[PDB]
Amino acid sequence: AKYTEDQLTSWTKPPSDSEQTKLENSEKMVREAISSDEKLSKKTIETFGQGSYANNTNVRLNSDIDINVKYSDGFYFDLPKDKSREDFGITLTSYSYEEYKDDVENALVNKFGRSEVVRKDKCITVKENSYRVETDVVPTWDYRRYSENGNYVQGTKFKTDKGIWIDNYPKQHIANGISKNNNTARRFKRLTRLHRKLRYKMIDDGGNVSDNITSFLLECLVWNVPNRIMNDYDTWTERLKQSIIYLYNNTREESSCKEWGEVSELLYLFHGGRKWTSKDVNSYMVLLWNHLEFLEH
């Protein structure tokens, strides 16, 4: 094996002892930028971490914290095709997502200064300093997806500056990750961190990792590793090996994994709209396997 049991074990750990303190300080400073703003303070706006700090799966020291500022005085929605938006109840508003993202930028600029705040395609960044971690603020709106039977699931929706509309379910992602971690004696998030770290390590020493393989994708893949692979093997060498075998075997043909969801279980991994394919995943598993140099016969 290229890495010892001690090395793999150490890469299952958070990269600092104060991950939660960093997340909470970013959340609070953004929440304050919002409540100090005359315009936005009058609206229902919830500030919450999403992303790898909120899921306690970050592995890069002082990497960006992802902070959602979700406005919920109106919600976008989607209905099944045999239901009428009229009969559901339509609300018209002169407010818009575009104005909202500008407003959030203004509030950030007022709290932190124009030089510290950078508008980007999908977020607004607050630059790090000695006291704060670099923070990506994602303004979103409330979102409801209704199913056939009349139930709905609630998430977030936003629009990139290039005009792409994107739905997410950060709360169900967080809750589900916590469930699987509870059912695996906390090995699910340790295995996630280990896989994420191995990816960065292969990239750093020159490996041919496809741009299509992201840290988010790796968490979704480990999510789809059944709990017994975490629970029934006794070392990290073996849990990692078995997880790779499972993911390789089940991406050799697209029919084996076409139903896999992301952690929220409310979006698919391989139903379009993604920059990866299951073939990409399979080839990454081959690369990782060959990189780890497990002893053969």
Numbering used by the authors: 2 to 298
From the article:
The native structure of ClCdnE was refined to 2.2-Å resolution. Like other CD-NTases, the ClCdnE protein folds into two distinct domains. The NTase domain contains a central β-sheet composed of five strands: βA–βE. The longest strand, βE in the middle, extends into a flanking β-sheet with strand βB’ on one side and βF and βG on the other. There are two helices, α2, and α3, in this domain. The helical domain consisted of six major helices, including the first helix, α1. In type-I enzymes such as cGAS, the NTase and helical domains are connected by the “spine” helix, which is broken into two upon activation. The separation of helices α1 and α2, which correspond to the “spine” in cGAS by a short loop in ClCdnE, may account for its constitutive NTase activity as a type II enzyme. ClCdnE was most similar to EfCdnE, with 44% identity. Despite the differences in local regions, the dispositions of the NTase and helical domains were similar in the native structures of ClCdnE, EfCdnE, and LpCdnE, respectively.
Here, we determine the high-resolution structures of cyclic di-pyrimidine-synthesizing cGAS/DncV-like nucleotidyltransferases (CD-NTases) in clade E (CdnE) in its apo, substrate-, and intermediate-bound states. CD-NTases share an N-terminal core domain with templated and non-templated polymerases of the nucleotidyltransferase (NTase) superfamily, but the C-terminal helical domain shows a higher degree of variation. Three conserved acidic residues in the central β-sheet of the NTase domain coordinate with two metal ions (A and B) that are essential for catalysis. Based on sequence conservation and structural similarity, it is proposed that the cyclic di-pyrimidine-synthesizing CdnE proteins, including ClCdnE, EfCdnE, and LpCdnE, form smaller donor pockets that act as molecular gauges to recognize and retain the binding of pyrimidine nucleotides but weaken or exclude the binding to purine nucleotides.
